Design a protein around this ligand. Structure first.
Ligand SMILES: [Zn+2]
Ligand SMILES: [Zn+2]
Lengths: 842, 66, 93, 51
């Protein structure tokens, strides 16, 4: 009963589709070909039906033939139709076959090496990981000698891609078959002078192994450096570059500590910085950039001074390979603790500001990222004030391209250092540059928008004297009437709202509120959300009636805004309505608040969790301001309306009252709602008490004995739906009153909840099973097992089916807690049942 | 393996229940401290002695039909 | 409607959830007071499985947590809480 | 408000003027620099010079 077939699996889909009789008339062991169709069953079929094929092939690969098995398994995954899950399944199958066919995988080494090699060089990380795993499995299948004899003659591939693939294959084979297991063979086959191909492939395999292993290069660090030091003074520049790359990879893998083996080539690395030419000096600098942070504190200064002769001199890079390498080396040197801030400010600050700190890289994305990262890393060491008073020009420049990177670096420095290193003239220059960048925002540059808030936060109390500048800036950016411009202005105002409005001014509040409530009908939902956020920030910073928009006008104006279906707009409007009743909170007619609550009650279960949280955060203050009795009566009347598709949320609103007011605000009012003889009235009351005790928290311990009879009367033999509600209430109240000293009422409720265990309803047992699983963990097995012990061997076959299930549910929980709870099973004459090892008197 | 090991089911024999009882009651003896420093005071043996005794008793205690 | 779970060795992978299935716990299925963060096994974040919801089984938008009523009951200490069954298996639509 | 608005406008104008002045100064500085660099004139092909 496998699933349907597919035209993509037509390579071996003739078993279940055609009369491919491998046992009637076919070659020897032709059924293994049908096993490929079984592989389709592993791909096309069920999870257990797919794993059964692998479980069977695991005990049949030895009796299937290595040749045909490989010839049918390799092309199956070699095709481009190998999906991600399909690739994983094929890799697992090949690994199982190799674990079964260990010595048989030797003749097929030429196959997987030609197949797993490209897959290991794929683009996706999962593909490379699967290729490396397949290569490691193939290596572990046969011996190291087979892998050596396979990867050694493969060096004749003159193609650079083929050579790199062979080097990566050898590195993967050595990373799993033992690094020192293949180290001597590789060192003996690569130490010769055949040609540049082998000399390059040696360093390539070394770097590939160091990159694939990772932190596992600590013991084999010197063992590999002993063979890699033959290229540090190599004649050919290509071999020298390969050796430098391998040394840098090893230093990065074995970093930061353990620079002992690095001293074996540390002298040439520190000498040849200003000795090589072009690619040689580039490779030397790239290796020194990694060796510097791993170096010690004494020789680090000497190495930096020896490398600066060729680093600071060639800071201006004709190409990108030199510029990026120099930037990385400078970043690594700044990260090192050797060169102090004084040396950087003396010999590193002026060169970095002259050759690097400029608008000459306003279009290089990689350069714009590298220079920004290096500046952000070096600002913490050279002082933020040393750069805050020296980068106030690139942002104010008319070139917006370099201005974006300058603002990004300034924001990064402000976020890293903070606001301590901020001079008066430096602060004024930074404010002027930020204002010029924000005003001259001809493009969509979010860097300035993100940095304005950081600068305002760094201002702190200094933003008060600088109030009118930012005020006029925000006014010019808000009255521009541009969509994206207004959005960015509202965002920047909401970010820097608490810093400016909360400065104890009482003068800009009106000027802000007049423009805030003006553009209330923005068609763009993002602009509307930004305006709502700005108004919320103003209401949080301003008060009643300190806020410019009147409360009696902003409330009815914001009322229809909450009815919108926009996600961000509604999310902001909920918080705005909540904060409207934050400080003073009256500012409304009771009918308006009741209507707002009735409208928001339908949004308490929205898809976005943010709206669900904001609704509960606002309804609490709404109910605290309106009143307990009115809100309770409204919620109770709302229980019958809004039929059970969104009715339960209303019950949650009642719980919000319990979370918004004292427990006696909803308890006595909801108690009278049970006196009605209606079935789905008491049912709704119980469904509401469930969420009430599930969300009331640790407050149930204060009042739990007064609600015991209300749950007991509902737990009686009343109906089939009035039983799950009482059990859920009990389970959600026991967990909430866990260990708080209310076990009496818990026992009172359990006395009734136990007889309801005998229920054949498949949908009604879980309501009691969960109650028992909660009572076991909130009561202790010393009493639950005491109840459940009388029937552990009851004669009824359908009575033990529930008692053993409850015992299992009470066993995995409190496994060793119930050990000192069992009775003394007396000793029979056929064994030793009594546990006499616990009846000592000592 | 670890599906439900530790307890039987609807027709679990009394012996097979007491066997799991003792087999999971000694692990609270070899692991717990008060119930291990208390048994080495009664039997008057060291921790290693009592622990090895309890470990060897986990072969088939309670009276094994072996 | 009895959902199944993976329940394998809980690795060092954090949980996730969809834009609609982010609040409720992967096991308790409740939105009330998330206590601890959920995890996954090794076969729950592997290639295509990277950053997938534990309930919706699609895109991840947050971290999968457990309910306070489900973490106090020691339910989080079970295997991989990924919601997978015979129907919700790897080869599902 | 018939006087406050005017004052605000004046302030804005002043700010704009200041910005313009700053820009002019920057331009002048750039011109001066163009008088002589700068790491080594056009230091881009010097480090390259083939490969
Ligand atoms: Zn989901
Ligand atoms: Zn899982």
């Amino acid at each position: 009963n496998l699933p349907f077939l597919k035209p993509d699996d037509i390579q071996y889909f003739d078993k279940l589709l055609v009369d491919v009789d491998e046992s009637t008339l076919s070659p020897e062991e032709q059924k293994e070909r049908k096993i490929m169709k079984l592989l389709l069953k592993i791909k096309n079929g069920t999870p257990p039906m797919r794993k059964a094929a692998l479980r069977q092939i695991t005990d049949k690969a030895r009796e299937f033939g290595a040749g045909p098995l490989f010839n049918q398994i390799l092309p199956l995954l070699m095709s481009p139709t190998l999906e991600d899950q399909e690739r994983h399944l094929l890799v697992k199958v090949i690994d199982r076959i190799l674990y079964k066919l260990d010595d048989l995988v030797r003749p097929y080494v030429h196959k997987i090496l030609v197949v797993i090699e490209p897959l290991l060089i794929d683009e996706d990380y999962y593909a490379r990981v699967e290729g490396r795993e397949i290569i490691s499995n193939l290596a572990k299948a046969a011996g190291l000698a087979t892998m050596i004899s396979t990867m050694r003659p493969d060096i004749d591939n003159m193609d650079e891609y083929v050579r790199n693939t062979t080097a990566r294959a050898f590195a993967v084979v050595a990373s799993a078959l033992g690094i020192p297991s293949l180290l001597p063979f590789l060192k003996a086959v690569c130490k010769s002078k055949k040609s540049w191909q082998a000399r390059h492939t040696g360093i390539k395999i070394v770097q590939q192994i160091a990159i694939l292993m990772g932190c596992a290069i600590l013991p084999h660090l010197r063992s590999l450096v002993e063979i890699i030091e033959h290229g540090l003074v190599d004649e050919q520049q290509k071999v020298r570059t390969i050796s430098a790359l391998a040394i840098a990879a090893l230093a990065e893998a074995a970093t930061p500590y353990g620079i002992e083996s690095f001293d074996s080539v540390l002298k040439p690395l520190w000498k040849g910085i200003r000795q090589h030419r072009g690619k040689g000096l580039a490779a030397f600098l790239k290796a020194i950039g990694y060796l510097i942070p791993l170096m010690d504190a004494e020789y680090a200064n000497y190495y930096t001074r020896e490398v600066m002769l060729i680093l600071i001199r060639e800071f201006q890079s004709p190409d990108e390979e030199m510029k990026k390498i120099v930037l990385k080396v400078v970043k690594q040197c700044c990260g090192t603790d050797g060169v102090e801030a004084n040396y950087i400010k003396t010999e590193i600050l002026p060169p970095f500001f002259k050759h690097f700190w400029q608008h000459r890289m306003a279009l290089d994305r990689r350069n714009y990222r590298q220079l920004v990262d290096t500046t952000v890393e070096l600002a913490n060491k050279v002082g933020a004030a040393e750069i805050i008073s020296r980068i106030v020009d690139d942002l104010k420049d008319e070139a917006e391209q370099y201005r974006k990177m300058v603002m990004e670096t300034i924001e990064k420095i402000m976020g890293n250092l903070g606001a301590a290193d901020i001079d008066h003239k430096l602060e004024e220059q930074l404010i002027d540059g930020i204002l010029y960048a924000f005003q001259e925002q001809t493009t969509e540059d979010s860097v300035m928008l993100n940095g304005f808030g950081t600068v305002v936060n760094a201002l702190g109390k200094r933003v008060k004297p600088y109030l009118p500048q930012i005020c006029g800036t925000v006014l010019w950016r808000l009255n521009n009437k541009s969509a994206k411009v207004r959005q960015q202005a509202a965002d920047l105002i909401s970010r820097t709202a608490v810093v400016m409005k909360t400065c104890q001014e009482e003068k800009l509040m009106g000027h802000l509120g007049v423009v805030l409530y003006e553009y209330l009908g923005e068609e763009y939902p993002e602009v509307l959300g930004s305006i709502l956020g700005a108004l919320k920030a103003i209401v949080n910073v301003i008060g009643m009636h300190k806020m410019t928009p009147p409360i009696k006008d902003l409330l009815p104006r914001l009322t229809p805004i909450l009815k919108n279906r926009h996600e961000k707009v509604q999310e902001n409007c909920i918080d705005l309505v909540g904060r409207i009743a934050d400080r003073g909170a009256e500012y409304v007619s009771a009918r308006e608040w009741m209507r707002i609550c009735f409208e928001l009650l339908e949004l308490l279960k929205a898809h976005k969790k943010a709206i669900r949280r904001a609704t509960v955060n606002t309804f609490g203050y709404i109910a605290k301001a309106i009143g307990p009795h009115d809100v309770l009566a409204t919620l109770l009347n709302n229980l019958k309306v809004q039929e059970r598709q969104n009715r339960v949320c209303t019950t949650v609103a009642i719980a919000i009252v319990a979370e918004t007011c004292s427990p006696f605000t909803v308890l006595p009012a909801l108690m009278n709602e049970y006196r009605v003889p209606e079935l789905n009235v008491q049912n709704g009351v119980l469904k509401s008490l469930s969420f009430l005790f599930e969300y009331i928290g640790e407050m149930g311990k204060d009042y739990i004995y007064a609600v015991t009879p209300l749950l007991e009367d509902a737990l009686m033999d009343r109906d089939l739906v009035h039983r799950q509600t009482a059990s859920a209430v009990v389970q959600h109240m026991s967990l909430g009153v866990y260990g708080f000293g209310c076990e009496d009422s818990l026992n009172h409720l359990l006395n009734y909840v136990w007889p309801n265990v005998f229920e054949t309803s498949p949908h009604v047992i879980q309501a009691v099973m969960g109650a028992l699983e909660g009572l076991r963990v909130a009561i202790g097995p010393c009493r639950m097992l005491q109840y459940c012990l009388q029937g552990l061997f009851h004669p009824a076959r359908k009575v033990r089916d529930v008692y053993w299930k409850i015992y299992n549910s009470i066993y995995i929980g409190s496994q060793d807690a119930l050990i000192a709870h069992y009775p003394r099973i007396y000793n029979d004459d056929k064994n030793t049942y009594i546990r006499y090892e616990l009846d000592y008197i000592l | 393996q670890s599906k439900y090991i530790g307890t039987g089911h609807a027709d679990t024999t009394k012996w097979e229940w007491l066997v799991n009882q003792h087999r999971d009651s000694y692990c609270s003896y070899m692991g717990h401290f008060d119930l291990l420093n208390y048994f080495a005071i009664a039997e008057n043996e060291s921790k290693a002695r009592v622990r090895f005794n309890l470990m060897e008793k986990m072969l088939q205690p309670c009276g094994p039909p072996a | 409607p009895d959902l199944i779970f993976c329940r394998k060795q809980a690795g060092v992978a954090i949980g996730r959830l969809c834009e609609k299935c982010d609040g409720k716990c992967v096991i308790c299925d409740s939105y009330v007071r998330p206590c601890t963060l959920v995890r996954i096994c090794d076969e729950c974040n592997y290639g295509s499985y990277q950053g997938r919801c534990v309930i919706c089984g699609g895109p991840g938008v947050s971290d999968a947590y457990y309910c306070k009523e489900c973490t106090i009951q020691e339910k989080d200490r079970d295997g991989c809480p990924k919601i997978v069954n015979l129907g919700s298996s790897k080869t599902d639509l | 408000k018939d006087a406050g608005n005017f004052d605000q406008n004046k302030l804005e104008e002043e700010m704009r003027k200041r910005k313009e002045r700053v820009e002019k100064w920057r331009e002048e500085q750039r011109k001066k620099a163009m008088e002589n660099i700068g790491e080594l004139k056009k230091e881009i092909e010097e480090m390259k010079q083939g490969k």
